[PDB]
Amino acid sequence: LLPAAMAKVAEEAGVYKATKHPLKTFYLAITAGVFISIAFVFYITATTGTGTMPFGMAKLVGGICFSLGLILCVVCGADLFTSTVLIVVAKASGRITWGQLAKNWLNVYFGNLVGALLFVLLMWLSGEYMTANGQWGLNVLQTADHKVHHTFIEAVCLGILANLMVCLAVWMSYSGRSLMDKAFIMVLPVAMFVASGFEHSIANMFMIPMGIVIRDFASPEFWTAVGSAPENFSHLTVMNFITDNLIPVTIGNIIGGGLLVGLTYWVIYLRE
Amino acid sequence: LLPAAMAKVAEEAGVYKATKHPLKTFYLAITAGVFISIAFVFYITATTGTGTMPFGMAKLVGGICFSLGLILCVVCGADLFTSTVLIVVAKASGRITWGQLAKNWLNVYFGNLVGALLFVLLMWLSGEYMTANGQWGLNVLQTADHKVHHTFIEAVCLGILANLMVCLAVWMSYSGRSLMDKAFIMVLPVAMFVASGFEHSIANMFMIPMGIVIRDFASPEFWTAVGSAPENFSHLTVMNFITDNLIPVTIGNIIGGGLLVGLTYWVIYLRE
Amino acid sequence: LLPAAMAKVAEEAGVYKATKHPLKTFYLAITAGVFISIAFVFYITATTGTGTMPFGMAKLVGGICFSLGLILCVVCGADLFTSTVLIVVAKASGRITWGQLAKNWLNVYFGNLVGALLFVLLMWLSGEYMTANGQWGLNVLQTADHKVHHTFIEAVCLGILANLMVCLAVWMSYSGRSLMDKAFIMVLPVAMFVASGFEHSIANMFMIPMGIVIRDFASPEFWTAVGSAPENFSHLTVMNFITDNLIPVTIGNIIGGGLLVGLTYWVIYLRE
Amino acid sequence: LLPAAMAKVAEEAGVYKATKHPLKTFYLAITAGVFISIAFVFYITATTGTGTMPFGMAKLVGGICFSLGLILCVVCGADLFTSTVLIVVAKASGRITWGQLAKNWLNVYFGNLVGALLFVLLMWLSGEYMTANGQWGLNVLQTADHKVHHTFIEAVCLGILANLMVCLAVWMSYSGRSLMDKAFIMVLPVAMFVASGFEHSIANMFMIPMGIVIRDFASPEFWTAVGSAPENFSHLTVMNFITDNLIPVTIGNIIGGGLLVGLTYWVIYLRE
Amino acid sequence: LLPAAMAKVAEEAGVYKATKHPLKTFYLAITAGVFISIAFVFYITATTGTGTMPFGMAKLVGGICFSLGLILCVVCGADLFTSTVLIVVAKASGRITWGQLAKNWLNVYFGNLVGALLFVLLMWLSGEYMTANGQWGLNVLQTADHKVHHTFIEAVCLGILANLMVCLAVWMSYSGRSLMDKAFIMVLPVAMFVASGFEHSIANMFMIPMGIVIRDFASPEFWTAVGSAPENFSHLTVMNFITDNLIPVTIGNIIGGGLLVGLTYWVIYLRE
């Protein structure tokens, strides 16, 4: 597709998604949350034990593994919060209403949260935090620990960049016609935002709660194996999650996805 | 293919499989079991001697080598037990009966068992357990050993995750139109389920019997080469396999493949 | 496409680019600068801590990661300065005048500058320079310092090489028709020009200003962690950048991209 | 292509191959042997100097490099002996006679042997055995040495496994319609058989004669370079090759390729 | 395309190239030489500092990097010498005369030499030999030194093997129709001949003269950094290059390209 055609199909997807039946949107958001949880589990598995490997190569491979979740979302038509920020193109064109925008945003947000929590529960019940002699759980705990130590502006900017990359991956997916065209065009754009450590709202909704669960309910054998204590991650709290991470990263995701990609492309190809 | 057409072709495949001749289904189940045995053998060869490599990269490469088996099943049209769980989509639409589904499931399960046992016999007769100064047999023994030390809930959840990933790979291949559309879209979902160590019934009924026979009839030279004894794998018995692994993993596979993918997508795209 | 058709579509791209509204070209140039800076951030991330890695393999991996930005430029229709030097094919045939080409070049250059500066600001606000205990900022500073120690002749020749490779990658994408035709054919040409350390104007006007910003506004904790001082990069000034690097590299880019690819292929396939 | 269409085109290819001109078949078999020797040369080049590297990664990369030769035979239409076992499908359908099967098999075998010997001569005259301070010749000698130490049952089973993998690589390439569809789908099945040490007749009639030639005619400088002696490979003999390796591996290839792939698919898709 | 259609399109390409205007052939030969020197610069950059990396993996990755030059030659239609040997198919069918083939070969040879020399000048004026602190120039010198120490028969056989691989890569690209089929089908055949150290005339035309330039005109700081002296490269002379390298390598290239690929396939698919 030509870029004007990509803008047109983006507008069509925006009007199509916002007018869907709300319960169908809720189930699709649940599946999208499960897909992002799957992608982050793959990222954690790939980066387990890579303390001796080069930092950049390990981050790049982990980001490549994380690209599976967005591929699943696009191919299966799941409703992902960061991917549905592009339906603001339809709002800017006047083809959907502000109320529809807000309702779809809230519905997809809640659905991704529910799916992420359900996959967190299923992930905990599988005993995966003890694989690699507990290095899996320690990897999750270290990932969730550094994600709550950022400032407000810093976290907002990381979210802006993360959803900018995600929305650029989704827009480049509109150009392709075949399955490989859509899938392979999102590998590098997603590996870019994951390897750089940009903050993703739905990914954080799986990582930080899973770290909290591991910290709260870890067996003594896990702490003996990893050589750590729960006192080392005392900042892994739900309130700290919402304050330090969730709100600024979600705001940054909204700003990035809406203003930087969708609105600029609507201005350039669709305002006239 | 769009997700609605994807659900439609999934319903078509579910109807087609249940209505095939029993002998054709049995033969294709045998071939699917052989394909999964081939994939896990490729995985074992790919993970030989990686005690020094990072855990994540080794598991990811081994999982990528495992994608060959599901690609073989999809391209050659063989009935894998986890893939035939997706005939529940046709069952939920009323196009097939409960008895047909049960007969097809039992036939495919028996065929998978026969194929896995035949490939176990072929692998034993080929002398492959002595590869890499016996490290191939060592890898087989340790892979089979940790598969029988999971609790019932843990094994059920691991099977749920494994068959969820496998059925997501199979469902996404419905979107593909050409050969490499189907092939390359399935590398990541299977590499994930292998790298994360999720328990798959069909791969288990190959490797756990493989490790059992290796432990039972290994030559003394192998034991001197590996620096081990049959005593350290004393729990690798057939009854231990059936109780600790086979039943919970099969139950988890059924639950995941049916409810999480098949019935969810039937509800979303085929309920009305 | 055959080479004659490739030259014809290059001609059409040259006239079509030179006839957009000036604001549209400015916006597309800004997005092109943002994409190239995304690619360069990916290059820094993928090559952080690769001091123990072989020089060539780390450079190649970073260059492959850098290919994301130019793929974004070609797929999304962004206006890159080194890619718009190919519109000289349209000028050589007389379908556009010298004034249109000069105005288009100035507009694209200024838009690229604005985009690179905005992305520099965004990456500074995110705190990315402290990644890997300051190794990310250290890699940024090392890359920026090495690029200002080239004399005029070597800088001009390196720009010639860089834009020759960029314009060859752009030219090869004209042959392809699908998205993966255009995507994969430009991975190796960009990876080779990044790995070999050729001087790209648009990449540099994001790289060096970011190094200047890091030098000026880094916290003393960063310097303590990296074991260096801001005095060790005293040559990273704006005027030194503009004189020793920007001007010769831009001149070399223009010469390479225009003469070596554009006018040469116009002579071969369009002069008769 | 669906599996029924794949079986149909397999039948058509089997009928076409058996009825071609004997001289054209001989020349195609010569080119196929040359292609297989090229693949094994690439394999040895890739796997030289990897004593310190993990067994799994080294074998997998060597197998990926081996994929080139099979793609050469498939795309160029060369007659590979293992691939021409699949023309037994035509025999089972009665569309060709037993004598046609025997004549085609003998012609392709002789042509493959002639091509392998010609490439052995060309590789010996090129002085490639001294690459990397003699590590190339040492790799050839060591890999050839271990291939003649297998018992008859081991050789038969290894040939069965190898040619099964090769014939499944060929069979799924029937599904593909594009050149790269046939190419990439065959990389994993060939890499699986190479990495797992499975025994291929055509590859062996190149390697073992190459090892014999290297042992017999190497200069003493090569021997001092490798730190070994020709006495260390006393079992690399022509008679030992023919007895312990060629006959059983060929028997295993015939049995596997005929019964397990061709006849199985004929039973499933062609008997009715 | 089928092998018969591939031979037909090879004949068409041979007829078309021989009947082009001499100046167009000269310009395309210059661009082809530039492309091949681009490939060799990529190969040198990728393999810089891989003295600790295994020999096989380093050579294979370098061959992956070298495949860029052939992609440029096939996609952009440039006249590269070993590729233009395949016009012997047209001569064998009688569609072109001996004189046309002779002038075409001479023109392509001279243009390739001119392009390689101009690009040697471009890289020497860029200071690339100082990359990686003298390791880039040292790598070029080491690559150039080993190529001029091969015997006449060894050089002829290396050229034969190299040109066989190039003509198989080109002849395999005829089947592919879009850009990505042609591009990807050539990476492995080129990586095979580059990793194995086979001798390519046009590649040597850039390699050895570049090493001569580095030896003659390098600053003494280069010699102190690399810890070597120009006395260690006394055999790197222009006359030495032409005698020991250029003539036998070109003879082997012609023999390979003519007899092995072009004439054999003409006999198989076009004589009768």
Author numbering:
A (entry chain B), B (entry chain C), C (entry chain A), D (entry chain D), E (entry chain E): 10 to 281
Published text:
FocA belongs to the widespread, evolutionarily ancient formate-nitrite transporter (FNT) family of pentameric anion channels and translocates formic acid bidirectionally. Central to the FNT family’s function are conserved histidine and threonine residues (H209 and T91 in E. coli FocA), both of which are essential for pH-dependent formate:H+ symport into fermenting E. coli cells.
The model reached a resolution of 2.87 Å (FSC = 0.143), with local resolution ranging from 2.7 to 3.1 Å. This calculation unambiguously confirms the 3D variability of the symmetric pentamer and shows that individual protomers have different degrees of resolvability for all regions identified to be of higher flexibility by the 3D variability analysis. The findings from the 3D variability analysis (A) were recapitulated within the asymmetric reconstruction, but regions with elevated flexibility exhibited asymmetric behavior. The N-terminal helix is clearly outlined at high resolution (1) but appears discontinuous in some regions (1′). Similar asymmetry is observed in region D98-L110 ((2) vs. (2′)) and the periplasmic region A227-L245 ((3) vs. (3′)).
